[PDB]
Symmetry: D2
Subunit: 227 residues, 4 copies
Amino acid sequence: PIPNNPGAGENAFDPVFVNDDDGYDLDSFMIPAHYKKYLTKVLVPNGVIKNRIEKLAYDIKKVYNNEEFHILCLLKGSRGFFTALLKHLSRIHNYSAVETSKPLFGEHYVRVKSYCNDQSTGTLEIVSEDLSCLKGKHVLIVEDIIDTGKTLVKFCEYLKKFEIKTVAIACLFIKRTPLWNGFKADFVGFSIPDHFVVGYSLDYNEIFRDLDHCCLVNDEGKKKYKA
Amino acid sequence: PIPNNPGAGENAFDPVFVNDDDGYDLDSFMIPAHYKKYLTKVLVPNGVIKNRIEKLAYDIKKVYNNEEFHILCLLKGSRGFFTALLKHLSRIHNYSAVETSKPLFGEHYVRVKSYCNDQSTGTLEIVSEDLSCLKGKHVLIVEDIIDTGKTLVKFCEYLKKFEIKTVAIACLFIKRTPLWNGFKADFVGFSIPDHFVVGYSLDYNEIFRDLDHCCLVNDEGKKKYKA
Amino acid sequence: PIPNNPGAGENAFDPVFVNDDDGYDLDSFMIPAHYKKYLTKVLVPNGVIKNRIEKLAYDIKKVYNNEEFHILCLLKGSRGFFTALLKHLSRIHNYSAVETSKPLFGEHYVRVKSYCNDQSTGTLEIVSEDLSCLKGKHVLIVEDIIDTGKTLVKFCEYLKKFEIKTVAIACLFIKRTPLWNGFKADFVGFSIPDHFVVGYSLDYNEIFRDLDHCCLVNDEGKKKYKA
Amino acid sequence: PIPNNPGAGENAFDPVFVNDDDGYDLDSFMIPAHYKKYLTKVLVPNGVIKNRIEKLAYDIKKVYNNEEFHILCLLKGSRGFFTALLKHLSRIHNYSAVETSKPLFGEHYVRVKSYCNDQSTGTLEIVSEDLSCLKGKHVLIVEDIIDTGKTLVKFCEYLKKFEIKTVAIACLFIKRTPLWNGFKADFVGFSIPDHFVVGYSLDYNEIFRDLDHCCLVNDEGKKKYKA
Ligand SMILES: O=c1[nH]cnc2c([C@@H]3N[C@H](COP(=O)(O)O)[C@@H](O)[C@H]3O)c[nH]c12
Ligand SMILES: O=c1[nH]cnc2c([C@@H]3N[C@H](COP(=O)(O)O)[C@@H](O)[C@H]3O)c[nH]c12
Ligand SMILES: O=c1[nH]cnc2c([C@@H]3N[C@H](COP(=O)(O)O)[C@@H](O)[C@H]3O)c[nH]c12
Ligand SMILES: O=c1[nH]cnc2c([C@@H]3N[C@H](COP(=O)(O)O)[C@@H](O)[C@H]3O)c[nH]c12
Ligand SMILES: [Mg+2]
Ligand SMILES: [Mg+2]
Ligand SMILES: [Mg+2]
Ligand SMILES: [Mg+2]
Ligand SMILES: [Mg+2]
Ligand SMILES: [Mg+2]
Ligand SMILES: [Mg+2]
Ligand SMILES: [Mg+2]
């Protein structure tokens, strides 16, 4: 059935497991010249993230089938994930679509903020907006990464007040940090070591979002761009 | 220099001109089976839009050079445009980037609503993170289409109270409609005939956003999905 | 059923029709700086060709269903067409493939030469792996463009001696030239005006194969690269 | 300088190193339903191969600069590699190209064959063709994988008789097999464990070429499709 136990990831499929020492030299891939000095290595190449997101879209389609749902994007680190997910979801649905078929999902955006440098501020800002349009709807939250779990634990709590029919979570990354609060997604791309990552829309004080690969910012980058 | 006369498009390059009778049969390209009955034809295929956006990114990079600017995405219709632009902007910039280079842009979102069915309600609703963070910044507004010109003339008026350094406009489509108030973009993709279009994130009552090509919704489509 | 009347295109769907004056300014799309002076304009952008080829792959899959066939690539002009076709054929087929499914096609190459400058030398030279391996097989010839029809009428004649089960033709372009001998493809992408085109693997004395868009070489280009 | 010691890989950059136990579950990525039972795992995802090929193209451009050279594709397992390489090479060259620039490379194809099942036959068939056009030219051989090294050792020997100016080797994979004869490429994508791989144009008796990811065929697939 459709998932509806936010944070429990009751029937979640295992993600790709990135070992603690997995990764690649920056010289093995295309890296913007000026960013090189601020990264220690490539963790997950752009291409593998894209390939994995395609399977996630397949997993999602398999769970919702033809059931109309609404994708809620958690801006802005979620952009890379969201775009690729929508691309693949649409092709999968539309390729199998028949003349009597109907659209599969609606799309929504919510700006959520809590980080400063490489740490959560323990507080979450939610850019207010009437979410009444989601009342009685199946919503699929699309997020970039679960770290401490505060963003999702909090946002899901916030969502409750809108009488949404069902709440499921699609997340690109899940970090193996001792700070984790236990929040689990229903669809997860990769399980990654405890390092602050940038790239694929994920940033460090608004920097590195344009970096194609998921990389590890080094101490020099953290210091150079510290708030 | 960098554009700073919102609505004047003072030095805008000419857009691709889509003739009044330009278009393609629906059977010439891939169209989701269930959407076929609600479209009269393909106006601009996905591939041409992507190719044009790449050139547009080239033009923008040429104008800004290395000057840091902030892209303002006008949700929800401009998503397709926006993501394609970022992709090309990033590659073009990063391909020529040097070790001593710097990032080129920041990204922001604002949800602006005014349409019901295929007409402007003559009103405007806004939702976004505090726009005061644009003070003293060069901002590039990324929009899907200029129709009556109400959305952009109004939004640009609202932007004035935040002491933004410069305000330029990048628009995918500009419709040749007698309703046009004269607002011109600084970067425009295509000039199209007076028809309500859907696809490439452009919708008709939230429908067709997933349609890959820019098409014309037929009367049956407008009737079927009337609000 | 599967086509088997080479040159008749008995049940071919109509191609996209490119009017005699259709095209775009070179400044509307990305063009390699050094090629600009040798092209008069863009006839068909890379993106439209890709979109059309996807539909063509859809048509081919629809005709063959699960019948195993062998794609014969006519080097060197059809490379762009060929690779794009394989990509789409593979995804369309594999997306609907089931556990009990089977591969859909085999791939082969034949180099056929006959042009010098912008004209057919009226002769044909062939180079390929033994074509006897096509005996009893359904073969789909993948070609870039039908001009006079000499290449395909001749090659198809040569194929007769190898007891091929079925011979069908997939052609990206078909030129509306008074020189046409009547040979028709079973799957055709575009019908274009009488002009020598380059780009998308199509060359002029080995030049312009890397040009992304199908363009018209101007006289300066033909003169500069005359053999 | 331009490499010219075929098989020595004198200044070759280290490739991406795929450890003996590296790889992913077939369920982590998109795998054609009917192929699943014939593969043990995903070795290198399609996306990482594409990302790596982009850097290889960058490495090549950096070595040849504006020096005209000729790419010689070793058909047919080489297709996937070749296509992506040409795409990236052209963009890199054409993005930095200036009005006075000129094309960077010519393209050529040579069908070479030696395998039966998962083993070399110790013999090499070369589809004859006048290679005199390469006389005094810098040629870049583009091959899919170095296994025993017989194909390249032999083909390079064959090439000598054509008075080519320079001979360099670009290879996507290099297998860590005890059967290796010592032949090294000048540009190499990945170093992989000793397993017969299929996908990305690489086959097993003409099967699996359409598989997007580089995977390991299991004993059942080898038996099922044995010659
Ligand atoms: O390692 C990281 N790199 C980049 N962004 C982040 C984030 C951002 N912070 C949020 C997750 O944080 P948390 O789970 O700690 O509440 C997400 O919305 C992310 O966009 C966490 N960890 C990282
Ligand atoms: O023909 C159309 N198709 C789809 N959306 C629209 C719009 C939406 N309305 C806004 C432009 O409206 P206007 O210029 O009329 O104020 C844009 O933000 C669009 O998203 C106008 N015309 C169209
Ligand atoms: O206008 C053109 N531009 C580029 N190549 C060609 C060709 C090449 N010539 C062959 C078709 O020739 P024909 O039909 O004249 O025998 C194809 O294999 C093409 O590669 C014909 N016309 C053109
Ligand atoms: O593991 C493999 N999978 C698929 N093809 C191959 C080949 C093919 N055989 C040639 C390399 O073999 P070798 O180096 O042993 O002469 C290349 O041309 C490849 O296309 C070798 N190993 C493999
Ligand atoms: Mg976030
Ligand atoms: Mg962040
Ligand atoms: Mg809008
Ligand atoms: Mg709208
Ligand atoms: Mg030809
Ligand atoms: Mg030619
Ligand atoms: Mg081979
Ligand atoms: Mg082989």
